[PDB]
């Protein structure tokens, strides 16, 4: 009954089943870590129209406070989720754009110096998108991405 | 071949557990097991009633639950209320006429009335939530899913009292009646004796356990605080029922109390494995039709179903029965809360001697 | 062909209070019968801890008692052991196969709980009072005196669950078992269980309280305080028991309930009479063995009889007897307490229209 705010800014009815599907990823290879504990914990309080920006949100503040000593496994869960929320805002998706493009769009919003244009050629900005690696973001801890972050 | 008062002054000390000699006098000064001894004193003092919940603020809350939502509460209350309603006779019933102490048979009778207690609960829970009481209680005997359920419960505890009641009118041995040739040996009859406490363990372990989660789920949820708390208070009655009948299984399976019983108990090993799995399977199956309509915030099909395995394996471990699931960290830890000047000194000689 | 859980969905309102359906589900929200629905809420309300009593001060007070006033109080403390032993079990092993009705299922299974608690607390006032609580408990099995009473009590416990085992694995009609001839006619196992709840009621209306009368008589003399007060609270219980009984008897006596059973009582009424006859006799002649070595102020052998017949009527025509003993008054009125400048005004015209 109740309707939910996506990304995108299209609405559709509310769904438990994008959390359960997503908290259940980041839980993945963990141990001693629940996904209704995270659930639960959040207490989210939906209401009429709600962003679905708010309640992924919501969620990584959760499992951050699971962090504990008997089960640490959390500030994985929390950091995984972290960078998922931020690849939203960064590139629209989790799967990152071009390192060439990346820096060209930058560039005309003067965010990044335009020397690095000057300095490296399109043909080697594709050289070195090869060396990354966006898969070592989950080898960061909730402490580490939080900061990033802010 | 029963009587409530035995007239042969029998030592209750030396006597089994069961297929004893009928209980004559009420002493507590000595028990042969005070394990029993301690669970009626310790029953004793959680006695709870039903009343003093305030469970006025879940008849708002019920209604306020999306439509999905209902069904999960009221259907996990309605199979609560079955068995309690069940293992609120059946005690007394299939175990006083065969119980030959006194420290087991003042237990079971306290065992059964902590039973009815719940049965009490409930229907105080029902009225507040509901208008008509009479539309949920009437489903739990039409109900589909319900019914098997019962019917499972009901096939143990009868298969004992129908034979308990031929080793009493006919004993050991082979009788006709009507034409009709019956058997009655006295070790068969401990084993539906036995495999009947694999089933009243299993339904007061996991069966039981497996809708706290559900009524506590809410609970997380601020919602439904009155219907919570009572349903807290009966799990901890809950724990000293499960604990009871695992003591007597082992004490049975051990030889301790009847060396025959160690052998029999050998026996049906297999056949009690093949139990917990019928009943924790089963459990996984209310699942799927508690979640049919859909999911709440923490908690949902999949979830749930690793609790039951979860909790299988230590019920199972705890008798004596390999694990059938897989090992499992707990999946809903949550649960567990619901179930229990500067100093100023110097001294010039003491620094003195420190070589810079 | 008993359950403890039917599969039919039949209503618990109609259903008699006996011979009926066994119970299925456990729903208190409308009874056929609301007197038994009150007994439940005013049983629990009385829930006693024996322990909480002090006795302490009654170790003391007991070894003064000269041995044979030692005699009266530990003879009558025996019996009542006794009593509430068969009280302890006998309500839900016969009574619960039967009921068909679920407020009564559950104050039957409630009656039969708080008689443990009172088998409880003799325990814990022998083991004050005496030194080796063995002495004391060893002996209700082989004093004799005990004995008439003990067979007495189980005879016809059992021979009422003895039929409605056969009602259950047979049924009406007549079948054989083993060469051997059984008539299980339905019409015969509604005597036993009228003929045994006549004996419950006289034993817990007139067999219990004949003993009350000695336990209270040491507290007049303020001696035993603190058996006085369990002894106390267990009267208070007690009165429920005899009180559920009765009105069971009437429904019965009345054809309220089951037509056929007025009947059937009717029959009986001449043996039933005998009955209370017999228990109240059987009062007369213990008490005589309560003193054979002495009598203390307040009991008398014959201040004691007195009391038995007093109540006896009072008992009998409550279920609808003849009144076996002559009338007369309370023999010991001190048991029911344990039971429960001026105005100056002158006038002259006033006073001079009267003529002297
Ligand atoms: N319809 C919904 N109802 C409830 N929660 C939702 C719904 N849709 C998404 N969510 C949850 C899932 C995530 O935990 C969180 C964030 O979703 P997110 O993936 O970041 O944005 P999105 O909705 O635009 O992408 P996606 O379509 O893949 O879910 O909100």
Same mark, same amino acid.
């Given at each position: 009954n109740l309707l939910v705010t996506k990304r995108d800014g299209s609405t559709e009815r509310i769904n438990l089943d994008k959390i359960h599907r997503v908290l259940d990823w980041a839980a993945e290879g963990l141990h001693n870590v629940s996904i209704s504990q995270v659930e639960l914990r959040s207490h989210i309080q939906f209401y009429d129209g709600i962003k679905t920006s708010d309640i992924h949100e919501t969620i990584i503040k959760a499992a951050a406070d699971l962090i504990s000593r008997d089960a640490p496994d959390y500030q994985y869960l929390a950091a995984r989720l972290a960078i998922f929320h931020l690849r939203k805002k960064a590139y629209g998706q989790f799967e990152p754009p071009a390192l060439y493009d990346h820096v060209v769009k930058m560039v005309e919003m003067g965010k990044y110096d335009n020397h690095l244009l000057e300095d490296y050629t399109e043909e080697e900005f594709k050289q070195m998108d090869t060396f990354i690696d966006h898969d070592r973001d989950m080898t960061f801890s909730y402490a580490a991405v939080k900061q990033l972050e802010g | 071949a029963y009587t409530t008062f035995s007239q042969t002054k029998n030592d209750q000390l030396k006597? $089994?557990?069961?297929?004893? *000699?009928?209980?004559n006098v009420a002493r507590? +000064? *000595?028990?042969?097991?005070?394990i029993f001894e301690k669970l009626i004193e310790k029953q004793l003092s959680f006695?709870?009633?039903? !009343? !003093?919940? +305030?469970?006025?603020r879940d008849r708002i809350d019920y209604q306020a639950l999306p439509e999905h939502e209902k069904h999960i509460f009221i259907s996990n209350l309605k199979y609560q209320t079955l068995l309690d309603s069940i293992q609120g006779r059946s005690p007394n019933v299939a175990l006083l006429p065969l119980i030959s102490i006194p420290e087991l048979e003042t237990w079971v009778e306290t065992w059964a009335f902590s039973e009815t207690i719940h049965s009490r609960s409930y229907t105080h829970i029902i009225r507040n939530i509901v208008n008509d009481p009479s539309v949920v209680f009437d489903d739990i005997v039409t109900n589909e899913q319900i019914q098997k359920r019962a019917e499972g419960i009901s096939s143990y505890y009868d298969e004992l009292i129908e034979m308990t009641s031929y080793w009493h009118l006919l004993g050991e041995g082979t009788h006709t009646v009507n034409g009709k040739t019956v058997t009655v040996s006295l070790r068969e009859l401990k084993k539906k004796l036995y495999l009947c406490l694999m089933s009243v363990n299993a339904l007061e372990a996991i069966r039981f356990y497996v809708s706290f989660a559900c009524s506590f789920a809410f609970a997380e949820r601020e919602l439904m605080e009155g219907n919570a708390k009572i349903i807290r208070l009966i799990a901890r009655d809950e724990a000293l029922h499960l604990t009871g009948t695992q003591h007597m299984l082992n004490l049975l399976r051990s030889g301790? +109390? +009847? $060396? !025959?019983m160690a052998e029999i108990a050998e026996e049906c090993k297999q056949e009690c494995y093949d139990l917990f799995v019928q009943a924790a399977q089963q459990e996984k199956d209310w699942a799927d039709y508690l979640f049919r309509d859909g999911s709440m915030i923490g908690l949902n099909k999949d979830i749930l179903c690793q609790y039951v395995e979860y909790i299988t394996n230590i019920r199972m471990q705890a008798v004596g029965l390999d694990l059938p699931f897989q090992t499992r960290s707990?999946?809903?830890?949550?649960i567990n809360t619901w179930l229990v000047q500067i100093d100023s000194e110097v001294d010039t000689d003491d620094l003195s001697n420190f070589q810079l």
């Open positions: - | 006597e $089994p557990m069961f297929f004893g *000699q009928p209980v507590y +000064d *000595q028990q042969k097991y005070d006695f709870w009633r039903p !009343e !003093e919940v +305030d469970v006025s301790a +109390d +009847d $060396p !025959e707990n999946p809903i830890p949550w």
